[PDB]
Design a protein around this ligand. Sequence first.
Ligand SMILES: [Mg+2]
Lengths: 268, 363
Amino acid sequence: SDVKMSLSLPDKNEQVLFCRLTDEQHKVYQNFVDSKEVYRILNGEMQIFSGLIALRKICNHPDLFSGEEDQFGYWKRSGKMIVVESLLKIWHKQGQRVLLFSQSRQMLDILEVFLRAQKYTYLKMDGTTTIASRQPLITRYNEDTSIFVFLLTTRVGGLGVNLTGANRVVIYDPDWNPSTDTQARERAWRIGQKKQVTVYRLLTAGTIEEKIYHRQIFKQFLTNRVLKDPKQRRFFKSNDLYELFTLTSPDPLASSSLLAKMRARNHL
Amino acid sequence: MLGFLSARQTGLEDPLRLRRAESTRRVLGLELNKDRDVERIHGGGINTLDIEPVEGRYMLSGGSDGVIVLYDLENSSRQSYYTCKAVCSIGRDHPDVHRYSVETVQWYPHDTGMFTSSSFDKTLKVWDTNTLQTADVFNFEETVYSHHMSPVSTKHCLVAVGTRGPKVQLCDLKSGSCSHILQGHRQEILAVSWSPRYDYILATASADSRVKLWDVRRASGCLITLDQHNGKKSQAVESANTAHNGKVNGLCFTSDGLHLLTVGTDNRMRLWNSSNGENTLVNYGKVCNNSKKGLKFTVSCGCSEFVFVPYGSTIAVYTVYSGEQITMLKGHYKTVDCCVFQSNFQELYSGSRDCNILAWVPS
Ligand SMILES: [Mg+2]
């Protein structure tokens, strides 16, 4: 912001779409939050991780109960995948290049299958790809615009690489750490980006994903409290308790300036 | 001395000569004050004294009863006999009085409008001298043995605090930051003293028999560790390179800041080259101290240099660079805890466990 005017970067947008669980996805989510495992979690008997990861998987796509055109990972069974399908169609008809992130390798494979189901020319880079080929791959996506979508895991696709060839960026799945998402979204808006970029951060409304978004907003506020200014507004959207298992789908100083600073600080 | 005046008038000798020679002669003629007295207000022993660096008029004194008394040393009366009256007092009725003994009190350098006091109540309080109210308090997890503000720093305003913790705390007056600590000691840090010459050089003496010099700006620990033998008994640095054979409970940079005087519980004082910590092997004989806490001793200034060390119930005056014993100032009834030197008139003020502050004036 203090360098953007002195660097001639293009415009940026940071929209946050609140996606809607499908009937089948909503059914699986409601069945899980009504299951006995989450009940045991809320009683402190079991670790929270199983339920947390299960809910994140359900919001990503119902790959718990793998339900032709009914193969594993079919796009129409997940709301976020429906939104991604619409966005990819629009952007492809607009002749733009998209950077599709995911927290989960399995969800990245599902997105890859959905992309081959369409005619989109993709290019994938996750933790399994050999390191020696990663910088080449990036250069490929930065060089020829025939490649449309760049699939990424936020841990490898983020974190310092340059992907200015990408124009749109879509963060498919929120993470507990805000910084993962931040670096993933700044993979495109960098020195050398000659086109307007926008970030679409997909969350399922009233699910665990919205709660994770709230947790990481709280974390971002805590960070801004000490990085940019200490007048940060308190996080009031939620109390951040252990009720994220619920489905709530919508719808020289001369001793005087120094003494003054001492007096003012104590008064605070 | 008429020779000195004649040489000054005739330009034979620089007036510097007369000034420093007469300062030395006055210090040598130090004796129990004939016509001077100090008001008695401490119910317990005086652990520390500090005359303000600018104008040298007012003196702070912290007692073992926790009160802090502020005296005026100037003879505002017309008689030749006067008592150093107490201007102000953090007494037992003050809302912010220290709950336990005040062990170090220090005027803020560059200005007399503020002072600081550290106590065994685990607090370093910063007091506004005018309103006489605590401007700031810095709480510590363990009792404070000593503290010191840099007498030179126009840039930083750090207070180096030595507690029974093995860490030297650096409390920044600016943006109240007591988080900074220095690692490298192993037992209680009984004395701390900033270099009067170098802005960021701090000497710390701890009960592990070691004295360390730190550049507080630096990120790599202490600069120098003082070693008695300078290398004769050389070993990988885990327990060797000790400054003394006991607890080093007192530090004092010389007036120019080129040497460091360390007094330890092995009944020895040592003089160290402050630039590389080499022992100068000045003898000083046996300097009796058994204090379990910090020992406050000072050096002379503006003379042709002396060091005044508490020695039992006396003040031992030594020549810093030769070690020759000048004299014993003998007027206290119990062990002397502190002595502070008025450089303007070559005077001395000693506080001891007998609830007395005695003034020594040149005869
Ligand atoms: Mg980088």
